[model samples]
Target: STGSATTTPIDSLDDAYITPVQIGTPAQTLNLDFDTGSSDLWVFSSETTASEVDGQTIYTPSKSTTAKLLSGATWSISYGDGSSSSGDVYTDTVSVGGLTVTGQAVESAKKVSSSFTEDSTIDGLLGLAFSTLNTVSPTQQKTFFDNAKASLDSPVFTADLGYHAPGTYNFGFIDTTAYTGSITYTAVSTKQGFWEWTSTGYAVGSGTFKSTSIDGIADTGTTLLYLPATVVSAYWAQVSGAKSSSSVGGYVFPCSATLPSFTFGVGSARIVIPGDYIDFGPISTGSSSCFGGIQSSAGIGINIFGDVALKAAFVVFNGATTPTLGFASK
Candidate 1:
């Protein structure tokens, strides 16, 4: 059920990562963002209005022999980044790696936010969060991984994200060689439909890991790491040439600044984010300044261990009862 699902950057157009999947009978392949942060399998499609559609590739369900309209069922989702999309639904066979699930609901976009319209590299999103979080109605849909659970030897998936390189998303089966150490397991609260866990402690740079707990979700859909306001400020203060820049929207520093590695505690274990990983990229192309990947949640209630933090570790998204998060260094 698992091997390696290659992750490609959005043509290096954005920080998001996407993996390939095939839908319908003969395999109409599309590159989808495998997001653990949200629930919905929505894609850009033929249903989109001509004016609303941009250069992005659209999925033509009518071309697929296995495609069937999910009459009346519809979905709409809004992201925190201010991007949103809405569409009707279709039911078809969906496959990832070598696993296939029949009658999986495929949301077809008819309306999308301008931000989404502008990003052509991302065709859609495949949500790995619990089915309870699916946005479709009058009936919600299960994710491809969920629909194929019975066929899987175990209800688990692993994410191996990389820096400036393609990572792998493994399903059902875990690859031993993907990680460097024994996985440290921690319980998660699926009641929120998220892989939510509590960080026992945290520290900025090479400082002490304070014994202050921070509750957050491991989100692949998010591009940055988010912590509480005070926690963010404290971390940024440690950076010599960094500041909260309104112009940059987050913390920014000169590209040559000596960055410090940040560490976090998890149930008797720790994960350290290297200094260079914190520098997301330049504020703009060819700019001398860069934006820090770690930032304040700005009162989002929970912290987010986004790609920046997760990429540093091998993550297990446990789907079994008593859901757990197992982490290991790469």
Candidate 2:
């Protein structure tokens, strides 16, 4: 039989979208950040350092009758921003919405850096990346989608992210009601365990489309849009008041600047990010300088289409024979 479910991802501090998931037999609910960049269903847990847990909810495996320790197994992961987490492993039944995937490996963290410890609201991360990226040692783990794919009618899922609002993650079926017009598709590479794809090019404002093939990842965990240095400079140049602020640590501009929407080339499809959303508000309260949501990918060779760019469109992470990214106007 086929199955599916809908998860409303909450917008938190414009940082990430969190999904509430049920783990274990009797069902212990944990709020998890749905991240497409990495593959691992790791949770802040009772085994974590008490001083490092902050106020986030911790998963207590002992409370669940179905929790089974993956004897001799351990897992650890690091992020580009220097965040890290590591811990032991346990097998548990995990369910999202109403779909259940039994025997899913749940990495329980024993240690977490201040990066995660400071986030009082997030419990852990539910990695939506390919199962190949799962970080467990000795044997890699399968992601929730991987284990449930055999039972899915279409082996697909859609991510409809919103700007500071509730968004939906639809599994097993595409919701025609969630998008407008036809869903344009672009081939994606699972080689890196990311939704990696190449965009033909992009343009600033309503300017003519330039030519440049940009290879980037559609990362839901990341907050802003990252492109090449040249692309970032070109877009910022169009804003008169825009300036590079090392103090703010990124391109900044007057909050009152009249910004224009940035557009990207997706084959024949174009995803345009509204200009007003470009200014990521002020650096802090009472600060006239505002940070730019779009920036250079820094030294990272690959670009990233983060929440700032994703919130404008409805996306599909098709996990069939050939994984693909389907986007449409919302």
Candidate 3:
């Protein structure tokens, strides 16, 4: 049998990890990464070679009657970090949180790296991020949202980051018990592959920079916030003793002192980025402290509000309509 998909935010990987759904009747458990960067769902399978696989959790399809392999249709994917995996395609009846969605696409990796293949607790990644970067083709690809949307009572998908409890990732439904009030809804715009929205301006600490209006995409896949060069320079200027170090990838500032808080205005909504996020982690070889959160993307066409920003707010993805995303509170 089938069960619900359980997702939680754990400190282990500095990201949200989802518990795998048991496949077939008398389901077996698997752990997975809930990623928004891609659209396809994959897992380590029995066919994966011991040397090629990493330490992460692997699922065996032999126990599932619904598993079907696509013999010759193997695939591979490489991330920006230079890590890759090659796998075979298969179709199965994947279950998440007691809900079974048939003809679900699954990937079984034959060769994988230590970073991707070696996390013993991480079985696979559940892609709920965006569709533009999806690896699957229209004719053969299908997503959890693609199926859940039709069954949802309100046709809405809400990401509740603060809900760290068990069994929270169920499909076709949202558990609003932990929330205090009604969720705020924002209208999504069509045409932008990323979740595009209009911002009133940026803020340093409590100070508001109303002169500049920002229009950018919100991505959960990326870990850090990327700002336009001018914006980045201005932001660093506001922080005392702030400097840029090329080796660290962006502008750096003193970590000993309290960095200014940054907030982005989305019409009536304001998303605040704490000082700690700005002064993230450690310093580099240049002795310039790498600002944890914000970075400058010189020629980048779009501004992306990544996971660091998304975790602070309750987000909703509304694909009921094409070309747009819907936002709501948790």
Candidate 3 global Cα RMSD: 3.9
How well is each residue in 1-330 modelled by candidate 1, as lDDT tens digits? 553578876744238898888988788888898999888998888898778777777789999999999999999898878889998999998888877888999999999988877877788899988889899999998987788777777889888888877888988877888988789999899878888999888888878878888899999998889998888888889887888998778899888887888888778888999888788767889998888988999857778999988988999988887789999988
lDDT tens per residue, model 2, 155-245: 9877888776778887798889998898999999999989999888998998999878999998888888999988999999999889777
Off by over 4 Å in 2: 1-13
lDDT of 3: 0.62
Q: What residue runs in model 1 are displaced by over 4 Å at the alpha carbon? A: 11-14
Residue pairs with backbone atoms closer than 3 Å in model 2 (clashes): none
Compute the lDDT of residue 272 as modeled in candidate 1. Answer: 92
State in Å the error of residue 12, model 1: 4.7
Q: What is the lDDT of every predicted structure here?
A: 0.86, 0.86, 0.62
Cα RMSDs of all predictions?
Answer: 1.5, 1.6, 3.9
Estimate candidate 2's alpha-carbon lDDT, on a 0 to 1 scale. Answer: 0.86
Clashing pairs in 1: none
| For model 1, the run of ten residues with the poorest summed lDDT | 5-14
